[PDB]
Amino acid sequence: AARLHRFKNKGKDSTEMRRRRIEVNVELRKAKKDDQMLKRRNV
């Protein structure tokens, strides 16, 4: 259907920016979490 999202730079919408920001946030949180878990458990 309307595949305009691959045209020019139309693929930069506030919703897309929001979802990108939150997914980077969740990877950061996960990395900190298992980092702490790894240090406290064992090498």
Binding site: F7, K8, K10, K12, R18, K33, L38, R41
Partner: protein
């Protein structure tokens, strides 16, 4: 009073009559559905009634029977299936006889038929529909109107009603549609209606799709339809062909040669926009499914298995004809170009991008002569074509094979940067932005960097339609500077970079374009800030004072943010208000992650006050308030052990934070934020643990919330035990009983999404179980007596993972966190679990793939578990 007068009135231009008629219709349908529907059907069945009144009755019956909202549709179906069968048959007959008596080109009774059948078929109260329609189609005496009305009704049927309920009666419907598809029909309207119907019905043609003779007859029918002089039939048959392509790629090899490709190229060669566009769409769908099949083939090759489906490189064989016509039609641009309307030119561009992705390196020789010749034409059309093609073909081949061309053409590109023609300037900006995004090695070139950078620097002052593109080009240059700087200057942090030498220059200009009055146009206001996040991120240690300076500027915007609470006048203004807060809230956490703790202390006080007020000012529109608390959380991730000064003015804010119970997104971060408090506040959250823990069970009790949140409550469960250590005894007995039910919950294997939903659900179960084990165990001393309270439950947990060990979906995370239990329990108990685990043999094979699992975190917990057993067996 005459309901035909009501039907006439509900089409005349008068709001009062419209609303009054709608009220009467709804009131009488609710009060007496059967009699009202019978009267409506009888009235519309009369040929002598005015066509306007008949259309009004048809649309009203459609509205009563179907609507946009699925739940209203479902409840109306349940209301309708309760009507007595005599009136059901009466209205069935009335609507059945209505068709063929209307001069209107579309059948108003088609919608009514769709609506009634919507719940007739699932209850199977109308089994004569298929033979009735077959007889109507096959009747030689049938006129044009009757045939088209029947076809339109069948199309609406196959469009709206759930596909499963029509599975058994598909064969005769397909036979009727094919018999009505004969090209001998004198009216094109019947052909187009049948084409719409079949294209909307392809979702269940598999019943009759298997036969070779039926397939050949249907395809010959559609091929002959594609030769019809009427262009509407042309586009309908082309769309139908497109959907067959989207459905049945396996068999089209038997037929690509004879007819299909010739018709497609002929459609492309047409000067009419629609036919050419449909051709582009068909070949693009071919391209996309070739991508999907290439992905499947790659999976099969890495797995060693033979792929289910096999491709034959259709585009690889068609590009030799596809390239010249696509390139030629790329030049059909218009002076007054727009972006809200899809046009054949942008379709050609996106199709060329897809073909470039598919053919990899088999496009360069076939397009280089055109761009090479037409990059310098005096007319801007051919220069635009050349530059846009150069930008679009930028991907697909490896960068090494493209390096000489881009490095030898960059001076020409910066030449066309400066030409007065606006459109070519826009395309040039897009091309340089994409060239920086994809391959950075060519972007970094001091021989050209300074001139091009200066050029785009003054260019950003131009119209927004180029300002947004050049801003994203600046952002692209920013992450290119990162990627080539972390390898160039230092590892822990950049010290001084080439772009960073002019960093003070660019950053303030981005603030200038941020203040541009036309920022709303072409998302300029959201352009700079997103680019601002990344350019501030690339702050080499020499850029520290500069980023401190803009930090000194940003809170003024937030200080400004304090002071327009009275200027909310329109929803769009509120929307723009809402948009602005989201970016600004992300700005601090963007910059607060790259500052000094001491420099963060002074701004911490003012930040809290700004964040304190705005959480409550915008009580409505909680979407922005989602971004709030993680922005507050980011302070906790840096402030650390100095954040305790604000809990006394944070606990009510946390309480109202989880007091929504309606949106999962707000609580999604809320459960995260408290999970973040534990890693910072450590044991000081103990006095505050009582209030939240009590609140937490309330959200557990309420089942109205979504299912995706449920693992998250288990996420915070594990870590809070570590923060409070052995103090969890008071609430200890509560959680396992709550977790016992969720762990014991099980479902079949029908839907993948819920299969992965339980995957994260069980994943959360494991980590929560580790957290309580770790919290009760201590840090350095032996196993504390606080672990005895969960000892009787360990066997059941071992049984829970046993079922998970028998599961077949699997993922790296699931097995990895599974290994956490055995290592923790073995450290927790040791001898007590050795006999328990040996009762279950499937764990031994579960760890074998743990040694095989590619993920390092999977391996580490995998080796963590297995070595623990070895010392335990050798312990005695």
């Amino acid at each position: 009073m005459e309901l035909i007068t009501i039907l006439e009135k509900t089409v005349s231009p008068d709001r009062l009559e419209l609303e009054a008629a709608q009220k009467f219709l709804e009131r009488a349908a609710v009060e007496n559905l059967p009699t009202f529907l019978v009267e409506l059907s009888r009235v519309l069945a009369n040929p002598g009634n005015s066509q306007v009144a008949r259309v009004a009755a048809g649309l009203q019956i459609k509205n009563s029977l179907t609507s946009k909202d699925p739940d209203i549709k479902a409840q109306y179906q349940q209301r309708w299936l309760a009507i007595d069968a005599n009136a059901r048959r009466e209205v069935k007959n009335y609507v059945l006889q209505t068709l063929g008596t209307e001069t209107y080109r579309p059948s108003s009774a088609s919608q009514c038929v769709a609506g009634i059948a919507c719940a007739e078929i699932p209850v199977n109260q109308w089994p004569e529909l298929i033979p009735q329609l077959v007889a109507n189609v096959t009747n030689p005496n049938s006129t044009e109107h009757m045939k088209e009305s029947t076809l339109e009704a069948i199309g609406y049927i196959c469009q709206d009603i759930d596909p499963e309920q029509l599975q058994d009666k598909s064969n005769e419907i397909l036979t009727a549609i094919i018999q009505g598809m004969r090209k001998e029909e004198p009216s094109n309207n019947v052909k187009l209606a049948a084409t719409n119907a079949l294209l909307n019905s392809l979702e269940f043609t598999k019943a009759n799709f298997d036969k070779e003779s039926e397939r050949h007859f249907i395809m010959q029918v559609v091929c002959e339809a594609t030769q019809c002089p009427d262009t509407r039939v042309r586009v309908a048959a082309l769309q139908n062909l497109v959907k067959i392509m989207s459905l049945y790629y396996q068999y089209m090899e038997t037929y690509m040669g004879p007819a299909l490709f010739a018709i497609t190229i002929e459609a492309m060669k047409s000067d009419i926009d629609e036919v050419a566009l449909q051709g582009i769409e068909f070949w693009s769908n071919v391209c996309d499914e070739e991508m999907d099949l290439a992905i499947e083939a790659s999976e099969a090759a890495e797995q060693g298995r033979p792929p289910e489906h096999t491709s034959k490189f259709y585009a690889k064989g068609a590009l030799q004809y596809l390239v010249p016509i696509l390139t030629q039609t790329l030049t059909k641009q218009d002076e007054n170009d727009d972006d809200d309307d899809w046009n054949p030119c942008k379709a050609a561009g996106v199709c060329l991008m897809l073909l470039a992705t598919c053919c990899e390196d088999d496009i360069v020789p076939h397009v280089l002569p055109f761009i090479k010749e037409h990059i310098k034409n005096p007319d801007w059309r051919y220069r635009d074509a050349a530059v846009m093609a150069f930008g679009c073909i930028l991907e697909g081949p490896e960068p090494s094979q493209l390096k000489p061309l881009v490095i030898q053409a960059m001076p020409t590109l910066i030449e066309l940067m400066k030409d007065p023609s606006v459109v070519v300037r826009d395309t040039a900006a897009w091309t340089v932005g994409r060239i920086c995004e994809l391959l950075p090695e060519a972007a970094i070139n001091d021989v050209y960097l300074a001139p091009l950078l200066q050029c785009l620097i003054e260019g950003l002052s131009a119209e927004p339609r180029v300002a947004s593109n050049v801003c994203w080009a600046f952002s692209s240059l920013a992450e290119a500077a990162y990627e080539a700087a972390d390898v160039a200057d230092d590892q822990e942090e950049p010290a001084t970079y080439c772009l960073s030498s002019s960093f003070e220059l660019i950053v303030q200009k981005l603030l200038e374009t941020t203040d541009r009055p036309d920022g709303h146009q072409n998302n300029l206001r959201s352009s700079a800030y997103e680019s601002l996040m990344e350019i501030v991120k690339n702050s080499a240690k020499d850029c520290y004072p500069a980023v401190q300076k803009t930090t000194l500027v940003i809170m003024e915007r937030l200080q400004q943010v304090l002071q327009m609470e009275s200027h909310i006048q329109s929803t769009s203004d509120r929307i723009q208000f809402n948009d602005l807060q989201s970016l600004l809230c992300a700005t601090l956490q963007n910059v607060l992650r790259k500052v000094q703790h001491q420099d963060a202390l002074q701004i911490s006080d003012v930040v809290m006050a700004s964040l304190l007020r705005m959480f409550q000012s915008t009580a409505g529109s909680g979407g922005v308030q989602e971004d709030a608390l993680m922005a507050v959380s980011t302070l906790v991730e840096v402030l650390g052990g100095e954040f305790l000064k604000y809990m006394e003015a944070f606990k009510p804010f946390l309480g109202i934070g989880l007091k929504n119970y309606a949106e999962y997104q707000v609580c999604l971060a809320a459960v995260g934020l408290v999970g973040d408090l534990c890693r910072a506040l450590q044991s000081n959250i103990i006095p505050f643990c009582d209030e939240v823990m009590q609140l937490l069970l309330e959200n557990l009790g309420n089942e109205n919330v979504h299912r995706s949140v449920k693992p998250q409550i288990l996420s915070v469960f594990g870590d809070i035990a570590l923060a409070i250590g052995g103090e969890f005894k008071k609430y200890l007995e509560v959680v396992l009983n709550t977790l016992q039910q969720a762990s014991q919950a099980q479902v079949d294997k029908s839907d993948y999404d819920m299969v992965d939903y339980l995957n994260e659900l069980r994943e959360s179960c494991l980590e929560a179980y580790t957290g309580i084990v770790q919290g009760l165990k201590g840090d350095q001393e032996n196993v504390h007596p606080d672990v005895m309270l969960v000892q009787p439950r360990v066997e059941f947990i071992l049984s829970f993972i046993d079922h998970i060990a028998g599961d077949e979906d699997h993922t790296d995370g699931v097995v990895a966190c599974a290994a956490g239990l055995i290592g923790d329990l073995c450290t927790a108990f040791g001898k007590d679990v050795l006999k328990l685990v040996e009762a279950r043999p499937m764990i031994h094979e579960l760890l074998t793939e743990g040694r095989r699992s590619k993920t390092n975190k999977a391996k580490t917990l995998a080796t963590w578990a297995t070595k623990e057993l070895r010392k335990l067996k050798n312990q005695a």
